[PDB]
Amino acid sequence: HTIFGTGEMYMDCLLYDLRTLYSEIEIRVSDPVARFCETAVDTSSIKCF
Amino acid sequence: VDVIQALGGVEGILEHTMFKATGFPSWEGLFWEKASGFEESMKFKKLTN
Amino acid sequence: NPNLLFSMTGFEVRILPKIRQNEEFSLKDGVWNLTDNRTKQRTAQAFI
Amino acid sequence: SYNGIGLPTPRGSGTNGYVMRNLSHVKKV
Amino acid sequence: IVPPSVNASVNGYPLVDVN
Amino acid sequence: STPELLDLLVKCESKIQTRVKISLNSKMPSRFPPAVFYSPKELGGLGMLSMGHVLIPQSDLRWSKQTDTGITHFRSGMTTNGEHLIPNLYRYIQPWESEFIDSQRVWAEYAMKRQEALQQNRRLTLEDLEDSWDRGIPRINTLF
Amino acid sequence: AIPGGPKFEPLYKDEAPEMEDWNEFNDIYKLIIRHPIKTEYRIAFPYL
Amino acid sequence: XXXXXXXXXXXXXXXXXXXXXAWFXXXXXXXXXXXXXXXXXXXXXXXXXXXXXXXX
Amino acid sequence: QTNASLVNLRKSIYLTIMSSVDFEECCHKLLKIDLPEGQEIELCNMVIECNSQERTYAKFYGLIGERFCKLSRTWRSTYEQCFKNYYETIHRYETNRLRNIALFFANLLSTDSIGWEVYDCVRLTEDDTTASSRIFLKIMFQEIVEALGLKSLVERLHDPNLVPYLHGLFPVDEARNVRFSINYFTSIGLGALTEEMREYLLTM
Amino acid sequence: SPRLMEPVYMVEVHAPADSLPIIYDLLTRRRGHVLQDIPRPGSPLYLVRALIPVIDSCGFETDLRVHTQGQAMCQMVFDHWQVVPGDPLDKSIKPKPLEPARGSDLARDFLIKTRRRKGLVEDVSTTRYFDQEMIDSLKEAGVVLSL
C-alpha cells in the first residue's frame, strides 16, 4: 500500500495518526519517493495504427 | 625487538620498574632465577591448601 | 547463482569466477587467486 | 548509533567505541 | 602438450642468433 | 577477513588482562600500562603476544547484510593509554597463499638442482640451498 | 546518538532474525538511492 | 671443542634485551660498504647462452 | 637535527605498518603521521623497504602502495620516482629482496596505478644492464603476465600513444641490441610481443 | 520518444548573511538552483528562493537547520513538473545498484525502480502495444532498433 502526501511533515503526522490513532499496530515504512509523470519530448516518429 | 622498540626501548621499559633501586650498574649482565630453591624443596612435600 | 560455497575443516570458502564477477573489489590479503593450468592466468577468486 | 556506524553500547567489548572516519576512503528526422 | 622449451624455440618462438 | 574474530580477540585478550588485574585486587587502567603485559619475559613483563590492539573496520549496517560495501569507518580496538603502537602478531606470520606460492617455487628449484647434481657425481650439500633454506610447506630443512 | 549528545543502552534488544526473512521490502533492488538517510532525519521526523 | 663453542652462540642469543640496533633505527654511517653486488647463480640470460651455444 | 628527526619518522612509520592488520587501516594510520612537506619520498621508500625485508611477498604492501597512488597525484608521482630510483640501485639487494621489490612494482603496474611511463628508464643493453636488472625484469613481467593474461599485455605494450615509448625495452633499431632484446624476451617466456620487431633484423 | 516528469518544490530560506554559502552548497549538492537571493526589506535576514526536485528534498530542512546552528528556517512548496534529464528507455545504461545516478541516466534508474516497486514487469514490451504489421512498418522505417 502506498500513501501520497504533500510533504515530509504531512507524512510524519499522517503516520503518527496511523500508528497511534486508528490502527494501534506496528508498521513497516519504506523510504519516501516522489510520484512521477510521463511526457513526450518529440513528435511520433512514424504513424501508429 | 619490535615490541621493545614500541614500548620505548629497554630504558623506557625499565623506567617503570624497580631496577634502579637494586643499584645494579648496568642491565646487560643481569639475569633472573626461575626458582628460589625454597620453592624447589617444597615442590613434592605434602602441604595444606 | 554465481558463487560456489563450501566449508572445509575450519575454513569458509567462496569461489567467484572472473566471468561472473562484473564487479571490482580490492584483492585483499584474504583472497586467493585461482590460476588455470591451461591458460596460465587467473580465472577465479576464493574468499576465505 | 550514528549513520549506521558503531556498536549499540561499548559495554561488553574490550573497546571504548570511538568510531573514526576512514581518512583513506576513495571518494570517486 | 609440447614442452615450453626445446633443444631452441621457447613457447614456440625461436631463439634468435646473429649470423 | 573475519570481522567476528577481531572483536572476539579484543574481548578475550582484554579479559586475559583482567584476570591479572583482579588477582592484584585493583583493575585500574592507570596502574597497568602496556609495558606490564607486553614487555618481554626477560625484562620482567608477562611477555604477552598481542593481536587485539587494532582498528576494527566498520561499514553502514543497513547495506552490510545485503552487499559488500567499502570500509567507510573504523572502530577502535583495545585502547592503549597514551601513544603506543603495540605490534600485531599477524604481521610476523606469512599468509597462507604467499607461503604456498613460495613453496611451489622452492620445491621446483630444489628438484632441478637435485637433477643437475645427480647428472654429475657430486653430493648435494648445504650452502647450496642457503637462499631457500627455510621455505616450502615441507620445509627444505627437513631434507638435511 | 547525536554526535555531541549522550549515549544510552538500546532499550529494545528485539532485533534477532526471528523472521529469518529480509521481507523483500527493504531490499536494494526496488529502492531509489538519492541521499543517505542520516540519523538527524530519524530524529527530526521520528514517525516517517 | 665443537660442543662448548655453543656456549658462545648461547652468549650471543642471551642478549635478549639489547642485541643490536634494529634496521629501521639505523642512523647514518661512515665509510659504508653495504652498496655492492648480489649473488646470482642463474640470471635471465644464462639460458640463451646454453640453449644456443650447446645447440651450435 | 634532520638525522634524529628522520630516524624518528622511520621508526614511527615502521611501527605503524607493523601494528596494522589490513591495508585500509594501515593507510588510514599512515596518513595521520605528520611528515615534512618535501619528505613524501620517505614514506614510500620505507614502505618499499618494509615490503622487501619480509620473507615472502604479501599483497598487504602492494595494496598499500596502490591505495596511496589512487588517493592523489603526488603519491603517484612519488611512486614513479621510487621505481626510477630503485631500478639503478637494484644490484645491491639480495635475490629475495629483489623479488619482493619486483612483485611490489608489478602489482603497482598491473592495476594501472602508476602508468607505464616508468619503462622509459629501462634499456636492455649489456652496457647498462646486469644480472640483477634482468632478474628484476623477469619477475616483474611474469607477474604482470599472470595478473593481466598476456592477452591484454600485447595491446598495453604495442600501443603506447603516450610518452612511454619502450625505447629500451624494444630498443631503437641500432647495433646488436635488437638480437639481445628478442632473445631475452623469449627466454623470459613472453615471446609473443617480440615478433613485431623480429622482422626488423630481416629489414636490416 | 517518451520522457519522465518529476515534481520540483520551491524553497524559501530566511537566513542571515553569513549562512548563505551553506545554503548555496546544499542546493548545489541536491540538484537545485537559486532563482533569487535578495536582502529582506525591513528585516536583518536574507531571503533565498530556489527550486529543488522532490526526489532530492528528503531532509533538506533538517540539513539546513542543523548546519546553520538552528537559524535559516525554510518552507517547501510544490511548484511544477520538470523532465528528468535522462532517457527512460535506454537499455545501454546499466547503473550500479549502490550509487545514485549522476545525470543522463537518472530517468532509466527511476523508471526501472518504480516499475519494480509497482510490480510491473521490467520488459516493457513495446511490441505488445502495436501489431506485427506495425513492427514490419518499423523495420521499413529503420527505427525499430530502439524499440
Chains F and B are touching, with contact defined as 3 or more CB–CB pairs separated by less than 8 Å? yes
Q: Which pairs with CB-CB distance under 8 Å and at least 24 residues apart come from I156-162?
A: I156/I116, I157/I116, I157/I193, I158/I193, I158/I196, I160/I116, I162/I115, I162/I117
Interface size, chain F vs chain H, as Cβ–Cβ contacts under 8 Å: 5
With an 8 Å Cβ cutoff, is I172 touching chain B? no
Give H52→chain E minimum CA distance, Å.
Answer: 7
Return the sign of the alpha-carbon dihedral for residues I82, I85, I86, I92.
negative
> What residue has cell string 621508500?
I45
If you write DSSP's letter for every residue of chain F in order, what string do you get?
A: --HHHHHHHHHHHHHHHHHHHHHTT---STT--HHHHHS-GGGTS--------SPEEE--STTTSSS-----EEE--S--SSS--PPPSGGGS--HHHHHHHHHHHHHHHHHHHHHHHTTT----TTSSSTTSS-TTTTGGGT-
Chains F and A are touching, with contact defined as 3 or more CB–CB pairs separated by less than 8 Å? no
Q: Which of F105, F101, F5 is nearest to F54 (CA)?
A: F5
C-alpha span between D19 and F132 (Å, rounded) = 44
Contact assignment for I191 to E10 by CB distance below 8 Å: yes
C-alpha span between I109 and I118 (Å, rounded) = 10
Chains H and D are touching, with contact defined as 3 or more CB–CB pairs separated by less than 8 Å? no
Please, what is the angle between helix I195-203 and helix I177-188, to 10°? 150
With an 8 Å Cβ cutoff, is F44 touching chain H? no
G 3-42: CB under 8 A from A: 23, 25-26, 31-32, 37
Give F39→chain B minimum CA distance, Å.
Answer: 7
Residues, chain J, total? 147
Residue F34, phi then psi, degrees to nearest 5: -60, -20
> What residue has cell string 642491565?
B27
Which of B7, B17, B20, B30 is the best substitution to test chain F (most F C-beta atoms within 10 A)? B7
Interface size, chain F vs chain I, as Cβ–Cβ contacts under 8 Å: 52
| AA letter at A13 | C
Task: Give Dmax over CA atoms of chain E in angstroms.
Answer: 31
- Residue C20's SS3 state is helix
Q: Which of F86, F51, F50, F73 is nearest to I25 (CA)?
A: F73
Which of F67, F72, F96, F99 is the best substitution to test chain C (most C C-beta atoms within 10 A)? F96
Residues 6+ apart with CB under 8 A from F23: none
Minimum Cα–Cα distance from E13: chain I residue: I191
Residues, chain F, total? 144
Give G9→chain D minimum CA distance, Å.
Answer: 6
Strand stretches in A1-49, DSSP E: 37-40
- Residue I105's SS3 state is helix
Q: Which cell numbers in the block locate residue F96?
A: 597462507
Quick check: J11 and J73 in contact, CB under 8 A? no
Residue I103, phi then psi, degrees to nearest 5: -65, -40
Residues 6+ apart with CB under 8 A from J89: J2, J108, J111, J124, J146, J147
H 25-54: CB under 8 A from E: 48, 51-52
Find the radius of gyration of the CA atoms of chain I: 18
Q: Which cell numbers in the block locate residue F67?
A: 552487499
- Residue A40's SS3 state is strand
- With 0-12 / 13-18 / 19 or more C-beta atoms within 10 angstroms meaning exposed / middle / buried, residue G26 is middle
C-alpha span between I54 and I96 (Å, rounded) = 9
If you write DSSP's letter for every residue of I159-186 in order, what string do you get?
A: ---SS---TTTTT-S-TTHHHHHHHHHH
Residues 6+ apart with CB under 8 A from I29: F55, I16, I19, I20
Contact assignment for I11 to B2 by CB distance below 8 Å: no
Resolution (Å) of this entry: 3.1
Contact assignment for J59 to G41 by CB distance below 8 Å: yes
Minimum Cα–Cα distance from F87: chain B residue: B3
C-alpha span between A9 and J59 (Å, rounded) = 10
Q: Cβ contacts (< 8 Å) between F40 and chain H: which residues? A: 16-17
Distances (CA, A) of C4 to C11, C24, C44, F64, H5: 14, 18, 11, 21, 58
Distances (CA, A) of H15 to B30, F46, H8: 11, 18, 11
DSSP run (H or E) holding B7: helix B2-7
Residues 6+ apart with CB under 8 A from I127: none
- Give the helix, strand, coil percentages of chain H, each rounded to 5: 25, 0, 75
Angle at I178 between CA I172 and CA I181, to 5 degrees: 105
Angle at J6 between CA A40 and CA J57, to 5 degrees: 165
Distances (CA, A) of C5 to C10, C36, C42, C46, I42: 14, 19, 19, 9, 44
| AA letter at J59 | G
Q: Cβ contacts (< 8 Å) between A39 and chain J: which residues? A: 2-5, 83
How many C-beta atoms surround the C-beta of residue F141 within 10 A?
Answer: 12
Chains contacting chain B through 3 or more C-beta pairs under 8 A: F, H, I
Quick check: I111 and I143 in contact, CB under 8 A? no
What is the DSSP code (8-state) at residue J51?
A: E
Quick check: I146 and I183 in contact, CB under 8 A? no
Residues 6+ apart with CB under 8 A from I154: I192, I193
With an 8 Å Cβ cutoff, is F102 touching chain I? yes
Of B5, B10, B28, the CB nearest to H22: B5
- With 0-12 / 13-18 / 19 or more C-beta atoms within 10 angstroms meaning exposed / middle / buried, residue J82 is middle
Q: How far is CA I44 from the centre of its chain?
A: 12
C35 has which bridge partners?
A: C42
Interface size, chain D vs chain F, as Cβ–Cβ contacts under 8 Å: 60
Quick check: J32 and J74 in contact, CB under 8 A? no
| AA letter at J94 | K
C-alpha span between A27 and I139 (Å, rounded) = 61
Q: C-alpha dihedral over I183, I184, I190, I191, to 10 degrees? A: -10
Angle at D5 between CA D1 and CA D6, to 5 degrees: 60
How many C-beta atoms surround the C-beta of residue I196 within 10 A?
Answer: 12
Q: Which of I195, I143, I139, I197 is nearest to I167 (CA)?
A: I197
DSSP run (H or E) holding J73: strand J73-74
Quick check: G32 and A33 in contact, CB under 8 A? yes
Q: Cβ contacts (< 8 Å) between G1 and chain D: which residues? A: 1-2, 6
| AA letter at F133 | W
DSSP count for chain J of H helices, then E strands: 4, 5
C-alpha span between F74 and F86 (Å, rounded) = 18
Which of H40, H46, H48, H49 is the best substitution to test chain I (most I C-beta atoms within 10 A)? H40
Chains contacting chain G through 3 or more C-beta pairs under 8 A: A, D, F, J
What is the DSSP code (8-state) at residue I85?
A: H
- With 0-12 / 13-18 / 19 or more C-beta atoms within 10 angstroms meaning exposed / middle / buried, residue F138 is exposed
Please, what is the angle between helix I95-110 and helix I74-88, to 10°? 150
Q: Cβ contacts (< 8 Å) between E4 and chain I: which residues? A: 189
Residue I73, phi then psi, degrees to nearest 5: -100, -30
Burial code (b: 16+ CB inside 10 Å, e: under 16) for B37-48 equals: eeeeeeeeeeee
Quick check: B34 and F60 in contact, CB under 8 A? no
Strand stretches in chain B, DSSP E: none
C-alpha span between I56 and I97 (Å, rounded) = 9
| AA letter at A17 | D
Task: Give Dmax over CA atoms of chain G in angstroms.
Answer: 36
Residues, chain A, total? 49
Q: Which cell numbers in the block locate residue J93?
A: 545504461
Give G32→chain D minimum CA distance, Å.
Answer: 18
Experimental technique behind these coordinates: cryo-EM
Count CA atoms closer than 13 A to G23's CA, side-chain side. Answer: 9
Contact assignment for F38 to B32 by CB distance below 8 Å: no
Q: Which of D17, F16, A40, D3 is nearest to G42 (CA)?
A: D3
